[PDB]
Amino acid sequence: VIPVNEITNFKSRAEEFFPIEWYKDMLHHHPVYYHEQTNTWNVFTYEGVKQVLGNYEFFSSAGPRTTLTNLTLVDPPDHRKGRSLLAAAFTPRSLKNWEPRIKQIAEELVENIQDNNEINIVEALAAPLPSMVIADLFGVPIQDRAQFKEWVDILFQPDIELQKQNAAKEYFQYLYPIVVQKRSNLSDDIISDLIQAEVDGEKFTDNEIVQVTMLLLGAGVETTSHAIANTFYSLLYDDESLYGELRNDLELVPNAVEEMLRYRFHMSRRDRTVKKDNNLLGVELKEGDVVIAWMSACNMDHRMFDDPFSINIHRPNNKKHLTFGNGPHFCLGAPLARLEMKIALETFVKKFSSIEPVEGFELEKNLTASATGQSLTNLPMNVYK
Amino acid sequence: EVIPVNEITNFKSRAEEFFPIEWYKDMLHHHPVYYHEQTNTWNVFTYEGVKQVLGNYEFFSSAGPRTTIFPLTNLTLVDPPDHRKGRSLLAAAFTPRSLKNWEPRIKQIAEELVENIQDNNEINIVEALAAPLPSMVIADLFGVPIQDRAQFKEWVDILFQPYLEDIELQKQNAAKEYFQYLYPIVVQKRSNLSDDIISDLIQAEVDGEKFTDNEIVQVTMLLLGAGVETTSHAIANTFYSLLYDDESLYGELRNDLELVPNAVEEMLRYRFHMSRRDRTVKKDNNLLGVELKEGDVVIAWMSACNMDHRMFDDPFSINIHRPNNKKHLTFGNGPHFCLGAPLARLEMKIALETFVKKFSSIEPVEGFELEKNLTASATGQSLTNLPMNVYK
Ligand code: HEM
Ligand code: HEM
């Protein structure tokens, strides 16, 4: 495993939460940057990251160093089978029917919020929504969602390591009978979709489906909670006028969501192992070289995004950011995350006329380590009707 | 505002700086264009990149507040919109005619030095040939009277030959004595045009303008600083390579004397370290693969780009038969290309031919330590002495 912390070498939690100064330095002085201590190549330009992520002919996901069942360590010469099987659960049809179910879960969370005093938007919406939503789309029976939610909070929400292997044991032992039941009772959920999915005649087995669900929870529960929490932090400490714009016209939420993914999702970075000699990045890369594509950095590249260090929900090409990746490994749950963010934002802005930060908030005292870097543990705010 | 290049390299021994082959490898492979935060400089190591920086005057200027060194008279800090006048005036002294007439005069000086070397006994080719030859040669082409060359040689040894505090006052006294001595000579030569560099600088005219007596003396001081020490360095490194690199090279040169030009050109590619010139960015561009803004300083490492496998096949090995050895960038590129390049090539060839023609073989000395015989210089580290045994 690659210790990415040595490449950045931050000396504070708040800097890692929004590494805007490091992004500037690396975009300006080290577009392609070899790090001697980790033996890794680091790319920050939009064109460079797009090459690394998309061009599978030269950059492989299968590699010793990392930062039909596991489609994240496989390349297109075999990736299509696992990709197509998993894509059958995320068709435009399923996404269309998930809007009222996700919208309904968000109503309970927003209707529960009353002002009176300061609220914690992380515990009240940012953290519970992805967990409650993914339990719904999995088809977990309603009477077990509490226990399911508890496992997900231990696994993917920030001795601790022994508590996690007991959660993994309980998860696999509980969900395997569920997958067996659903094969004889096809409902309208993801597990039922993974069962009947067929590619090249092959299908998933019961044991393979349980692993796949564990891959989806790890891929779109914490990252979605992070994006929702950062969206509210930006609505509080970045552009003050943005909230009033969203409430004047609710139709601007999709643009606001897409701009939060470009500007306020840190940090985004995936590795690729070089499979063929080339100088496609401006340096001579040999086979076996590890290249880290920094996407949260390339979303600030002025060669692609005009005025990149400012928030602008009217920038016409905000959707071409690389927070969801590029190429064959493009995020399969990207439309779901976009729907979750829009619904959580729409339902919130429709209720409250204005929001205001809290007096004594210190960013450094409310951050914890996470997969992307640093995540808000809580986010106090005052809300008004 | 001079740039301390030592912080970019940050060597931990003199021997590494004398032949930084491992550092070149890392930078060619991992940092082709390398921004250094402590000096705020861009560093280029690729052959194609260095050729852009050195040659493309439209974007890279020699006139710049920051320089890596320390009108019509100093043509090295000026750009083509004005560089042409000083260049042409100085070029009138280095025509193909003068170079042809300098061969017998340089050949005679090398004979004086080689017959003096004497047969058996270990010799120091730095004291015996590498150091004295460029000083004696440049005095001849300057037209310095024969009875005054001894004092002239001493001034050059203090100013441009490496070796507590007395040095800085000893050097400013040498420059003072130099300018006071040479000004009457230039006045005399205006009425006695001979066949030397000072006579050519007198009769030189560009755009109708000419040099004045005070301006010509400045120019001669620029030539001594530009082609006396660097040439001594190249000759000394050639003999070090003949001793510790390719053992078979000396016997090959003696079988066929016509290979000396190839040997000379390969020593300039392989064993001249370190070469580096600065350029200040005059226009926003991405011609090197990075976003360069106006006012940025770019250092073109030429001794490094001579090891670029994209241009020279098998670049880390000595090969005097490589067909493109002459495309190295040790003499620069573009409008500021070294004006004394044919002279330096002639001096190296003549010093090498005259030596191998006399001695059948050379052998290094038992207890030579490279680290104990190096001193600081303009290019990095220079040999103070180099013992060798000569035979036949
Ligand atoms: C803010 C939310 C999200 C972000 C930033 C995000 C980010 C990413 C990125 C960058 C990739 C590509 C990795 C690479 O190219 O190597 C990816 C892949 C993937 N994502 Fe997401 N994701 C999010 C939400 C979700 C959700 C809600 C799901 C729901 C299932 C999901 C499931 C997946 C899967 C299965 C893959 C692997 C697809 C493949 O490798 O072919 N993600 N994600
Ligand atoms: C091994 C021998 C030599 C080497 C490596 C060498 C190297 C160089 C280089 C690289 C430049 C260009 C620097 C730039 O682009 O800014 C230069 C310029 C110059 N050199 Fe040499 N040189 C050598 C010998 C000589 C000799 C023997 C003379 C005799 C007068 C000489 C006189 C000059 C002059 C006048 C310039 C100015 C050219 C201009 O600015 O247009 N050099 N030298």
Residue numbers in the entry:
A (entry chain B): 5 to 71, 86 to 176, 184 to 410
B (entry chain A): 4 to 73, 85 to 177, 182 to 410
Paper text:
Steroid hydroxylases are particularly useful for effectively introducing hydroxyl groups into a wide range of steroids in the pharmaceutical industry. This study reports a newly identified CYP steroid hydroxylase (BaCYP106A6) from the bacterium Bacillus sp. and characterizes it using an in vitro enzyme assay and structural investigation. The CYP106 and CYP109 families hydroxylate various types of steroids and terpenoids. Furthermore, NMR analysis of the chemical structures of the hydroxylated products of steroids indicated that the C15 region was the hydroxylation site by BaCYP106A6 with high regio- and stereoselectivity.
The crystal structure of BaCYP106A6 was determined at a 2.8-Å resolution using X-ray crystallography. The final model of BaCYP106A6 contained two monomers in the asymmetric unit, with the heme cofactor located at the center of each monomer. The two monomers form 2-fold rotational symmetry with a small interface area, which seems too small to form a realistic dimeric interface, indicating that BaCYP106A6 exists as a monomer. The monomeric structure of BaCYP106A6 consists of 17 α-helices and eight β strands and exhibits a typical fold seen in CYP monooxygenases with a centered heme cofactor molecule. The heme molecule is tightly bound to the central region of the BaCYP106A6 structure and is surrounded by α5, α12, α14, and α16 helices. The Cys356 residue is involved in the coordination of heme iron. The putative substrate-binding pocket is located directly above the heme molecule and consists of Ile72, His80, Asn88, Thr90, Leu240, Ala244, Thr248, Arg295, Ala396, and Thr397. In the case of Arg295, its side chain protrudes inside the binding pocket and occupies a large volume of the substrate-binding pocket in a substrate-free structure.
